[PDB]
Amino acid sequence: XXXXXXXXXXXXXXXXXXXXXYXXXXXXXXXXXXXXXXXXXXXXXXXXXXXXXXXXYXXXXXXXXXXXXX
Amino acid sequence: CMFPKATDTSFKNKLYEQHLGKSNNFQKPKPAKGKAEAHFSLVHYAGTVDYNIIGWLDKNKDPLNETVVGLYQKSGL
Amino acid sequence: KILTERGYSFVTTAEREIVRDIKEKLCYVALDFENEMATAASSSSLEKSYELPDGQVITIGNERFRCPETLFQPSFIGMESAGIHETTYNSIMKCDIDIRKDLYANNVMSGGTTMYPGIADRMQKEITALAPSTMKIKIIAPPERKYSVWIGGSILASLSTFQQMWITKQEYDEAGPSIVHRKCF
Amino acid sequence: TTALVCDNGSGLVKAGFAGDDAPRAVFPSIVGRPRHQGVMVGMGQKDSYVGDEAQSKRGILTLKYPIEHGIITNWDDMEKIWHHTFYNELRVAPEEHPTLLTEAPLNPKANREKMTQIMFETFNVPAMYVAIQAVLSLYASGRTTGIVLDSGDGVTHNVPIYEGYALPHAIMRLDLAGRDLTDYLMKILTERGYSFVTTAEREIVRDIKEKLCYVALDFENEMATAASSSSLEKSYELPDGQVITIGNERFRCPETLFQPSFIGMESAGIHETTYNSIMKCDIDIRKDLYANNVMSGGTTMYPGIADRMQKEITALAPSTMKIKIIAPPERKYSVWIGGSILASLSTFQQMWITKQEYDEAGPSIVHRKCF
Amino acid sequence: TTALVCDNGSGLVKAGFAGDDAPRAVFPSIVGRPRHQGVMVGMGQKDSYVGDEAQSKRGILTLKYPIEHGIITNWDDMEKIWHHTFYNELRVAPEEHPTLLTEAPLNPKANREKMTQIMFETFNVPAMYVAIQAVLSLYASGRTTGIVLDSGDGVTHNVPIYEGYALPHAIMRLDLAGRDLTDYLMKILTERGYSFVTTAEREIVRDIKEKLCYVALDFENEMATAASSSSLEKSYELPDGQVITIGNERFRCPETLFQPSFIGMESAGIHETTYNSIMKCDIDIRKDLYANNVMSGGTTMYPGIADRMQKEITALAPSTMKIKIIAPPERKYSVWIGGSILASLSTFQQMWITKQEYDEAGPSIVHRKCF
Ligand SMILES: Nc1ncnc2c1ncn2[C@@H]1O[C@H](COP(=O)(O)OP(=O)(O)O)[C@@H](O)[C@H]1O
Numbered sequence A: 001x002x003x004x005x006x007x008x009x010x011x012x013x014x015x016x017x018x019x020x021x022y023x024x025x026x027x028x029x030x031x032x033x034x035x036x037x038x039x040x041x042x043x044x045x046x047x048x049x050x051x052x053x054x055x056x057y058x059x060x061x062x063x064x065x066x067x068x069x070x
Numbered sequence B: 001c002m003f004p005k006a007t008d009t010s011f012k013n014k015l016y017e018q019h020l021g022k023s024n025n026f027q028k029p030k031p032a033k034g035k036a037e038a039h040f041s042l043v044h045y046a047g048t049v050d051y052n053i054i055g056w057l058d059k060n061k062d063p064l065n066e067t068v069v070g071l072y073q074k075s076g077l
Numbered sequence C: 001k002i003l004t005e006r007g008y009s010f011v012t013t014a015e016r017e018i019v020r021d022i023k024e025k026l027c028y029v030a031l032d033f034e035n036e037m038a039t040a041a042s043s044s045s046l047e048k049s050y051e052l053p054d055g056q057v058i059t060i061g062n063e064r065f066r067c068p069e070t071l072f073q074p075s076f077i078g079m080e081s082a083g084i085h086e087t088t089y090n091s092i093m094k095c096d097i098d099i100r101k102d103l104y105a106n107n108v109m110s111g112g113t114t115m116y117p118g119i120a121d122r123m124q125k126e127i128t129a130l131a132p133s134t135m136k137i138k139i140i141a142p143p144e145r146k147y148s149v150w151i152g153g154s155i156l157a158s159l160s161t162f163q164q165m166w167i168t169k170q171e172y173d174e175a176g177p178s179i180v181h182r183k184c185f
Numbered sequence D, E: 001t002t003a004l005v006c007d008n009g010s011g012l013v014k015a016g017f018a019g020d021d022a023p024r025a026v027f028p029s030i031v032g033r034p035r036h037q038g039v040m041v042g043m044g045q046k047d048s049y050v051g052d053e054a055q056s057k058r059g060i061l062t063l064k065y066p067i068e069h070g071i072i073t074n075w076d077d078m079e080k081i082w083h084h085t086f087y088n089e090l091r092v093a094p095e096e097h098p099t100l101l102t103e104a105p106l107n108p109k110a111n112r113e114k115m116t117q118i119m120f121e122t123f124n125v126p127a128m129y130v131a132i133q134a135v136l137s138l139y140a141s142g143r144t145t146g147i148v149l150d151s152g153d154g155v156t157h158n159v160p161i162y163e164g165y166a167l168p169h170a171i172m173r174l175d176l177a178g179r180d181l182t183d184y185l186m187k188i189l190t191e192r193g194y195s196f197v198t199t200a201e202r203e204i205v206r207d208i209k210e211k212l213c214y215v216a217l218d219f220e221n222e223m224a225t226a227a228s229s230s231s232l233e234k235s236y237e238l239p240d241g242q243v244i245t246i247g248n249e250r251f252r253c254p255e256t257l258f259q260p261s262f263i264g265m266e267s268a269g270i271h272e273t274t275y276n277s278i279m280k281c282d283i284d285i286r287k288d289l290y291a292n293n294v295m296s297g298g299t300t301m302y303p304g305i306a307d308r309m310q311k312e313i314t315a316l317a318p319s320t321m322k323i324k325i326i327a328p329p330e331r332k333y334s335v336w337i338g339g340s341i342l343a344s345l346s347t348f349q350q351m352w353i354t355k356q357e358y359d360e361a362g363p364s365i366v367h368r369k370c371f
């Protein structure tokens, strides 16, 4: 005969019960703007790299000093 | 054939498990001329004869309806 | 518990089965709940007149269409499981990623409730809510659904493989009911 | 002043000052709301409920669960929880302490960024940190190297840590935690077919998981005993109502960890994951880890896990070399305890985030600054 | 008669007669098996599945991957694959042709010995050969000297070849191929935290590796653009289901080749390995290689690699001398194409293995007789 408390509470409840809507709204929306940094993890990477390769390590001494021998 | 919406290849494979090891007188046909594909090779009183597949399975299928003759029985003729 | 609103009211088992006829005849599926309420305020074509199996004529309003919504909202007798459709999409999202399109294509329904006109449509509306609209959706609604099971059983009976598969008396001799639960699904 | 740590390792939630032995009190992180028309007009309507208050009130409330798979589902709900916890238990104001945050490793940045954003803005708090579980687990267990298994309420972990460093490539992370197992339990339970599904009904199982579980020593042999005996079968009451009595259905449950068929996935299981992740990591270290093997929290509570684990490693290890595992009593608390230790050392004064940075740069700060 | 070549360079598998321009068809070397009770009784149960057939069927199948690190894992599975390939695609009988085999260089004898043993015994085949990738790469690229980089599905290579000869000491061989990179990808991907791990789920990435990748021109500068812009970010669908949209996570991936920290190893990378391996090799030749620099297959597909490579060499080279690299269109096919050329020349009639030797001496024959 009506639209009621009973039905309004039904709608309210259903809203509360729907996990898909609210969880998707929070998680999927927040998922997209996720990331911006010059990561320190990559600072580690870079530093290690610096330590990594003979072309820096040996050559820095050997090209520089064996220039002048005598 | 009552398994639906599927392909004679399925049965090909079921042949290959079922008979192709087991059933001595039936054979995978050798290569031979005249034909794109032949699928069955078996041995007969006439000699030994080899035969092929188009997907035709449904052709043997028999539908029925009462209704069709059911009403024709009413009809004038 | 609806019907006492109009308050023609009877409770016993046979009286309850009398409703089954009305469930045959008088039900149809809500296309949209709000909009239906608006029509409910507007119109009486929503309202139809029906006899007792013997005795009175009875005439029924929204009380018809309100009934199936329970499937979508099991508040009205109150539970939580978020309903047929949300259960379905949930159970999908459990299952793995690639298959899903097929099921979006292949969607199948049968028997007692499904008899109602219109279920498939609002179901599709619901999936179009929940699906990413980008991908094809359809459902199957065969005529014969209520018989479907036994029909399929007939097919199941047909194939010789159950001769490999049946239980035989011999096993029941040699081992208990326990046999089944390994042997069958 | 003084320094305060929140545990948000999932399950009941743990919070306490540096240097207390154990957190003041602990809360499930259930959230729940009404289900029915409010019909005592005398009642004050509160629309959301949390904690043991809810745990009492449950029946007409219905639950939401704000962390899936270790990922926290709905922020404002968290904020409700968090506010409640401070004021009601802690009688604490956000200014009062640095605060330390406890994180699943290797999981989406968003939890970092919003968590920090909220807690610096919504709460205003001297210093913030977020720390990875395994670090605490080592500190509490006090062996600078190790590998940790801790399968809590939430997503389930393998990390080898070597002394003083991370091997983030090494690491394995799994959604196999006890909650989902429990929900599988019901699909077991209908065999005996006393059967109920809703959230509170699901938590009722948790008690049984406390009481009734124990670890399969050998699966085949257990089945043989299952055919022989009923001592395997024990009798237990409804929390109120019936006595219920449970067979192999108890021991079958943990095997899922070893075989996640029963709710079906492939990752070859805890132990095979572990040895896999080892064989990723390099050759020489391995003996130490064979020695130093460490486990904690929700699943580990079960009696016997360590034993069959060792059986498994003796399968997979070359038997030649020593093997043992650690199974401390306190594992479920371990994390927050370690956090307390973590709080203690002055170096975090070097290390904390301060409000100033949050002023001068965004949430982005964290991801460089923290692990 | 006529002569037939199998490519077993990993990834999809390539097979074709001498003198065709391109192999008839190509197959991943996935192998997969059922995961669930077979519950359509109408279905024929086949217990193993391979190739695009599986690629369709995947979902209930689960994958095994029969080549790790270019080393073929499980022989009988290979035999399944191999048999299928002959009969189903090729409609070919083992007698029909000589057959040519395609090998990672510098890898364990066993692959030689069993491969030959099986294929002469299980298949019975007029003539057999196994050939090292780089040789084909030169023949197709048609410069008698060179150095090759080809990082396929499998283990990743440096070989200088001088005209007409090998420098097997010179050679470098690396397990850095795109598969493992891809599995690192997931440990990236959880940052955005759309997250799934299983084999098929992992192969889904392969498409993204086709579509979405491109090579970093400069890492710092790219990060600066990453702060500036979203054109770096592109929007892509699930193969079915969602749209997904991906940031720096695309370009960050290839850098692993330059920096295998991100899954962490030391070998100083493709380019530094190359210049190292040069500086091993002798002094005069070098200019030619500075001129003749050649790349192929799976990783190389990415746009831009050659450019940053050249940037790197201009770093490491004395700038004084000419530098260029070759980046042919067809690189991913290159090997089998070269194999076709290899098949063509009558000299292999001098060179093939014949059944007779396999009769008169073992698999041992190969290791003298072939490279
Ligand atoms: N007495 C018990 N016996 C076994 N398991 C329990 C017991 N009490 C709680 N648990 C389980 O332990 C976990 C408690 O959460 P927790 O281990 O802190 O997760 P997290 O690692 O996310 O912090 C839950 O899975 C809970 O069901």
Ligand SMILES: Nc1ncnc2c1ncn2[C@@H]1O[C@H](COP(=O)(O)OP(=O)(O)O)[C@@H](O)[C@H]1O
Pocket (backbone or CB within 6 Å): E008, E009, E010, E011, E012, E150, E151, E152, E153, E154, E155, E177, E178, E179, E206, E209, E210, E211, E297, E298, E299, E301, E302, E332
């Ligand atoms: N369109 C594409 N873009 C980039 N990489 C691809 C593409 N298609 C395939 N790949 C990759 O190329 C490799 C294909 O195998 P292949 O290069 O033949 O390896 P192998 O050198 O062992 O033969 C795999 O690593 C595959 O992921």
